[PDB]
Design a protein around this ligand. Structure first.
Ligand SMILES: CCCCCCCCCCCCCCCCCC(=O)OC[C@H](COP(=O)([O-])OCC[N+](C)(C)C)OC(=O)CCCCCCCCCCCCCCCCC
Lengths: 55, 206, 48
């Protein structure tokens, strides 16, 4: 009984860490793409400037 | 919860393992110890707190930070139902385990009967003191059964003292300085005669 | 007297083979209890 109670207890925390870790990674991962979209947008502006010089 | 909650569980497994002598038993002890360590493994990783307001402010996709929070919180509410499990394990478990529950119970009853025999003997022995201070027929009453055996030796004419006793200690004490030191042979009756005789080509059976 | 394979009623315990074997066959059976619970809780909804 004490081994089952300690198993579900520690196992409950492991699941809790799994969720918050998932919710945090998905958030940080999304931020990474968001920054990439911003850099790609500004990169096009620089690309337009360089092409204007060539013209 | 974390500290000191597994001390007793280690003493039990240790003894169970010490009693194991054959390699087969030692193997089962290893399997048993693993499951205990597996179930009793402690988990401490400092579950981090999420501040959705911080992420919501710095940068996030509209509706995403809020959608993650509401969905995240929903699963956090769910938790294990320790009550249901607590009952099933205590009600009945491992009908195969009932095999040794009833084996060790009868095994213990055997050696509890012996413990009571030795305990009750030392209890009755308290009133018996100084055999040399009791009369003959009174000592035989304390040791009920000797008179019955003594009648068996008499009615079968086994009147050679110590013939039916495996260790006739009284016979060795009387022969400590006897000529031709010998004790009576086991279960020798004063009437049996195994003598033989033969006639050979020579005289005197030689 | 019916459901124990022994050649005598004078039971003498000199090893814990029969004891530990019945424990691993019992405590192990209750494995997957927590993982099974995780299935229900996690299959409830998708975080995304
Ligand atoms: C008192 C009133 C009533 C009295 C009734 C009579 C009571 C008699 C008490 C018992 C006497 C027993 C004598 C046995 C002698 C055996 C000694 C021995 O073992 O020898 C060892 C001896 C000595 O070995 P030992 O190791 O035993 O002793 C060594 C002795 N020292 C220490 C000195 C070295 O070796 C032998 O084996 C020789 C055997 C010779 C046996 C000769 C004796 C024969 C007589 C017995 C037969 C009589 C039958 C009569 C039947 C009549 C029927 C009508």
């Amino acid at each position: 009984a004490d081994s089952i109670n300690n198993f579900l207890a520690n196992e409950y925390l492991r699941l809790q860490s799994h969720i918050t870790s998932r919710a945090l990674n998905i958030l940080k991962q999304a931020q990474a793409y968001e920054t990439m979209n911003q850099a790609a947008l500004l990169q096009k502006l620089i690309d337009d400037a360089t092409s204007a010089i060539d013209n | 919860q974390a500290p000191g909650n597994q001390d007793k569980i280690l003493k039990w497994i240790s003894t169970l393992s010490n009693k194991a002598t054959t390699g087969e038993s030692r193997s089962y002890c290893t399997q048993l110890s693993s499951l205990v360590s597996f179930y009793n493994k402690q988990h401490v990783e400092q579950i981090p707190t999420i501040d959705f307001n911080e992420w919501k402010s710095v940068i996030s996709t509209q509706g995403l930070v809020d959608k993650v929070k509401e969905n995240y919180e929903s699963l956090i509410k769910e938790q294990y139902n320790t009550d249901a499990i607590s009952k099933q394990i205590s009600s009945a478990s491992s009908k195969a385990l009932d095999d040794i529950e009833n084996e060790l119970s009868f095994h213990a009853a055997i050696w509890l009967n012996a413990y009571a025999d030795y305990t009750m003997f030392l209890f009755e022995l308290e009133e018996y003191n100084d055999p040399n201070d009791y009369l003959m027929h009174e000592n035989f009453d304390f040791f009920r059964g000797l008179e019955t055996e003594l009648e068996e030796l008499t009615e079968t004419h086994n009147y050679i003292p110590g013939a039916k006793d495996d260790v006739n200690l009284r016979g060795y004490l009387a022969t400590q300085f006897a000529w031709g030191k010998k004790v009576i042979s086991f279960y020798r009756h004063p009437a049996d005669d195994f003598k033989c005789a033969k006639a050979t080509k020579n005289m005197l059976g030689r | 007297e019916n459901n124990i394979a022994s050649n005598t009623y004078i039971l003498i315990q000199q090893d814990v083979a029969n004891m530990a074997k019945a424990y691993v066959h019992d405590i192990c059976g209750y494995i997957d209890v927590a993982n099974k619970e995780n299935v229900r809780i996690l299959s409830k909804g998708d975080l995304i």
